Amino acid sequence: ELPGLERKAHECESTRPEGPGDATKPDELATTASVYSKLMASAAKLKATFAAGDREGERIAAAIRAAAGAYQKIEEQKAAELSAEAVVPDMSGIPGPLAIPSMEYPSAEMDWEAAARIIHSGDTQALSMKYFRDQWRDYQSTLEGHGRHFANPAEGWAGAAAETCAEAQRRLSTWWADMGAECGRLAQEATTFVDAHDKLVANHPTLENVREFEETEWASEWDRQNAWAMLQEQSEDALEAYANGSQIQEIRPGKPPSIGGLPAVNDGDVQA
């Protein structure tokens, strides 16, 4: 039994804390739909990548357990019952890298009463997306804490295999950190959005603006017309702000590093 090595291995398979959940768009405007699918696409892409990383962390655990099996083979070839060649860790039964689903990425007038309706037929506070944003943001730190599971090499283990695992462990550890920064990246892109949406709600004519105009007894058509003109301008001006002020970026996280073949292991690799 090689408990230092099993510990490292077990550490490596560690359950990754849950990613952020589903969000829903706050309304039915074209802008909203376009920006929303892009954030959903970005998030989709990250989950698929973290799953791939889950594989690598697990491949490493297998690597270490394979070396461990190799070490026990060495002690077995200490048959003092029959009275010291290096052994290659069996990796012929270790899962390969989990493929990252090649899913593609989206990319992009009406009267004010209608616009108003659509807007206020939705969540004017965009809580699902604010929540989505909140979650992704927090996951940054979490994913950083997660990578700490790999940062430190098995204790009392030296040799080429042990340094091979170490370097691979460090690369995964750094990568989970970088994946954490991608969370912060998504969240800032979400924030760009919910803030812009918030400005639209704040500046587009409200449902009160609608009734106030529909229930007004207008002296003439000139008064009624000129009063409409101003709310159609106000509608269009806020909606173009929303369109420009909400355009956002595609999150493209890099594939996790993989560990590959281990060398042979020797007696005296592991502490007594």
Scanning the structure block, which residue is given the tokens 């949406």? 197
CB distance 213 to 232 below 8 Å? no
Please state, in angstroms and rounded to a whole number, the distance separating the CA atoms of residues 111 and 235: 8
Question: Among 67, 44, 97, 19, which Cα is nearest to 257's?
Answer: 97
User: For residue 268, which amino acid is it?
Assistant: G
Method in brief: X-ray
Please state, in angstroms and rounded to a whole number, the distance separating the CA atoms of residues 122 and 108: 21
Could you tell me the residue ranges of all domains in the chain?
1-272
Q: Encode the chain in three state secondary structure.
A: CCHHHHHHHHHHCCCCCCCCCCCCCCCCCHHHHHHHHHHHHHHHHHHHHHHHHHHHHHHHHHHHHHHHHHHHHHHHCCCCCCCCCCECCCCCCCCCCCCCCCCCCCCCCCCHHHHHHHHHCCCCCCHHHHHHHHHHHHHHHHHHHHHHHHHCCCCCECCHHHHHHHHHHHHHHHHHHHHHHHHHHHHHHHHHHHHHHHHHHHHCCCHHHHHHHHCCCCCCHHHHHHHHHHHHHHHHHHHHHHHHHCCCCCCCCCCCCCCCCCCCECCCCECC
Please state, in angstroms and rounded to a whole number, the distance separating the CA atoms of residues 41 and 30: 16
Please report, to the nearest 10 degrees, the dihedral formed by the alpha carbons of residues 246, 249, 253, 254 taken in order: 180
User: For residue 66, which amino acid is it?
Assistant: A
- Give whole-number Cα distances, 108 to 28, 70, 123, in Å: 14, 56, 22
Please state, in angstroms and rounded to a whole number, the distance separating the CA atoms of residues 239 and 241: 5
CB distance 4 to 154 below 8 Å? yes
CB distance 138 to 180 below 8 Å? no
Scanning the structure block, which residue is given the tokens 């973290």? 50
Helix axes 112-120, 207-214, angle to 10 degrees: 140
CB distance 23 to 129 below 8 Å? yes
Within 8 A by CB and 6+ apart from 255, the residues are 49, 52, 97, 100
CB distance 8 to 67 below 8 Å? no
Please state, in angstroms and rounded to a whole number, the distance separating the CA atoms of residues 40 and 46: 10
